[PDB]
Amino acid sequence: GVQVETISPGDGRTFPKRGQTCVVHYTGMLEDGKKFDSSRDRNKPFKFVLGKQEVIRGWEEGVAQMSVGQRAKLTISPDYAYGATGHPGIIPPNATLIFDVELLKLE
């Protein structure tokens, strides 16, 4: 699945709707803590229309449970992220993935 632990409460009231642009700052790491991508690094918020499948299902499904402002810890299982093939050279096969994700705003 994806599972969501909170690290920061967000306004507790605004939650993403299908079609909205989620603006986020994330860090991605391997189940062993090993980091693999971060928008933080790049100093660039990342943005994706919710609903459009342009981000992994664990993100579609977990960021939709977050209120504006929230910082949360997402654990995503392979079936909800990159499956059995993985993404060679970045994500190995059947990797459970931990994302540290912060919802900055909706458009």
Add this chain to the structure above:
Amino acid sequence: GVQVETISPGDGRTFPKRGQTCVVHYTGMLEDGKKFDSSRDRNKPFKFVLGKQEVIRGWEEGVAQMSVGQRAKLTISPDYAYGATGHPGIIPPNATLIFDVELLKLE
């Protein structure tokens, strides 16, 4: 599977061994011709140790059938590349992928 059509014969005699560094210039496109990554663009040959799983199985298995110098057309089926999840925002699900690949040298 991967399937390999030739576009240029290579020396016909040197074939990659496990452990060797393959240096390649490729272009990747979607089964509809739509381009999605190219080392050519970047003017940078790409290099990967054969055998190490750091490139998709269709490449492990198809570039190993190429002699130094050869330019070949690789069609790779989802199971041999990015499976059913794909790589959201780049490769959609169950995509058959066409690579235009040229083997420049071995290290």
